Amino acid sequence: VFKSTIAPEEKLRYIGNHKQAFDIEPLYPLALFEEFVATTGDCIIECSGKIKQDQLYPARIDLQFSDKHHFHNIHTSIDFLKRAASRTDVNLNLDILATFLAGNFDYSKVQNILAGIDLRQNLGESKLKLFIRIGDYPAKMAVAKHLCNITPESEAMLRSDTLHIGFDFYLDGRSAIELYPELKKDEFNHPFIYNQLKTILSPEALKPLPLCNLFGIGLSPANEANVLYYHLENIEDFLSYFPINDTARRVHDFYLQQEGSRRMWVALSESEMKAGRINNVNLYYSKAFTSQNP
Ligand SMILES: CC(C)=CCC/C(C)=C/CSP(=O)(O)OP(=O)(O)O
Ligand SMILES: [Mg+2]
Numbered sequence: 040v041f042k043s044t045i046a047p048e049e050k051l052r053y054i055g056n057h058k059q060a061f062d063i064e065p066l067y068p069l070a071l072f073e074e075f076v077a078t079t080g081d082c083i084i085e086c087s088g089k090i091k092q093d094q095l096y097p098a099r100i101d102l103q104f105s106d107k108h109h110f111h112n113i114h115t116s117i118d119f120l121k122r123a124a125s126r127t128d129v130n131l132n133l134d135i136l137a138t139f140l141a142g143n144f145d146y147s148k149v150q151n152i153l154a155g156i157d158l159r160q161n162l163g164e165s166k167l168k169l170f171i172r173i174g175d176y177p178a179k180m181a182v183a184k185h186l187c188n189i190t191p192e193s194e195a196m197l198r199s200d201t202l203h204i205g206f207d208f209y210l211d212g213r214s215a216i217e218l219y220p221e222l223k224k225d226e227f228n229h230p231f232i233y234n235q236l237k238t239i240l241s242p243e244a245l246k247p248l249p250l251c252n253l254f255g256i257g258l259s260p261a262n263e264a265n266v267l268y269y270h271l272e273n274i275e276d277f278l279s280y281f282p283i284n285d286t287a288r289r290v291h292d293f294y295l296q297q298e299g300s301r302r303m304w305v306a307l308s309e310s311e312m313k314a315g316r317i318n319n320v321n322l323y324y325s326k327a328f329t330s331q332n333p
Contacts, residue, residue: 101155
């Protein structure tokens with residue numbers, strides 16, 4: 040009769056489990072982000088850990104809006120970014136996002152919105168995140184490609200029908216854009232497309248594809264090399280095929296015990312694919328929150 044709302048406690052429970060698993064202190068602006076999460080409707084929450092050798096960076100949480108209210112979802116997400124940026128010790132520079140959104144932006148061409156954080160004990164190295172997926176939008180695909188410095192060799196990876204765009208805003212004023220072209224299982228398993236992958240990507244980067252239903256590549260001037268994203272169909276497959284170190288294994292062993300998706304994402308570098316032990320890896324786990332009449 041009325042629109043349903045998922046209780047904030049259910050969403051914050053999932054985030055709270057992650058905070059407790061990895062000893063996350065209330066870094067700024069985690070409390071503001073939890074209030075933001077409380078105000079949302081149906082969503083998917085993604086928690087992740089970034090492993091660098093024996094160092095775990097676990098204060099990484101993204102929210103994906105499940106409904107299609109893209110204009111209003113972007114604007115509540117940006118309102119979070121700007122409120123967090125109000126504190127005098129923080130400097131956020133949203134110029135690259137202002138450039139992307141400039142003019143008469145067509146919000147009917149948006150497909151997904153995500154808002155998130157990656158917080159560090161060193162306030163300056165902390166960042167806020169915004170993701171916008173657009174489809175069939177030539178003008179704004181071109182803007183994003185220009186902001187991302189897409190050269191040939193990289194342009195071949197980008198699709199025309201859809202483009203997942205990420206914005207990173209560091210709390211010291213630095214900012215970066217990232218493009219994430221993706222292929223679905225049905226596409227990368229087709230011999231035409233695989234043979235084009237064989238030219239731009241080593242066999243090592245193609246190795247996990249049988250385990251996945253989605254494959255993506257992160258392209259950003261901020262990256263040392265392209266970042267490979269694998270959406271594993273079965274979280275239980277991970278430790279059989281990837282030789283991760285003890286620090287990453289602690290993250291994964293905890294998430295093997297959690298309620299949530301049966302799938303997971305792993306992100307790695309191609310060089311870290313031609314090597315014995317994986318010591319630089321991001322692991323992403325999620326849980327969906329859906330109600331009866333959202
Ligand atoms: C060393 C390289 C290029 C990749 C290995 C480690 C890695 C997966 C890095 C990107 S970390 P970040 O940009 O914070 O993660 P996203 O939100 O973009 O997924
Ligand atoms: Mg990135």
